[PDB]
Amino acid sequence: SMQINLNSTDPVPSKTPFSVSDADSYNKKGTVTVYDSQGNAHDMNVYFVK
Amino acid sequence: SMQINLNSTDPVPSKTPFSVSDADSYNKKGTVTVYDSQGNAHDMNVYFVK
Numbered sequence: 525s526m527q528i529n530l531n532s533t534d535p536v537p538s539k540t541p542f543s544v545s546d547a548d549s550y551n552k553k554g555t556v557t558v559y560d561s562q563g564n565a566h567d568m569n570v571y572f573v574k
Numbered sequence: 575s576m577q578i579n580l581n582s583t584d585p586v587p588s589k590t591p592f593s594v595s596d597a598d599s600y601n602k603k604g605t606v607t608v609y610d611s612q613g614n615a616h617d618m619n620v621y622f623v624k
Contacts, residue, residue, distance in 0.1 A: 562582050563582060564582045564583050
């Protein structure tokens, strides 16, 4: 469970495609940490694109 | 009887042949002592490699 506040005045991203490598194809990137049954962790990145 | 708690995130050692002199040939080394008929103490080393 994660919350976000946003700005209504954010322009549309310029990068028409999307790639995790770039830093423009998305409005903003966050991440979350999760665990498996064996204990070792994983990280999920989330990208907001207007 | 000895309980050891191994780790999931232990990377594979580097030195492919097993050597007790190079610490990078095994993931972990543990020791124990046993006794004989004479009464002298003998130490065993057990080496864990993933």
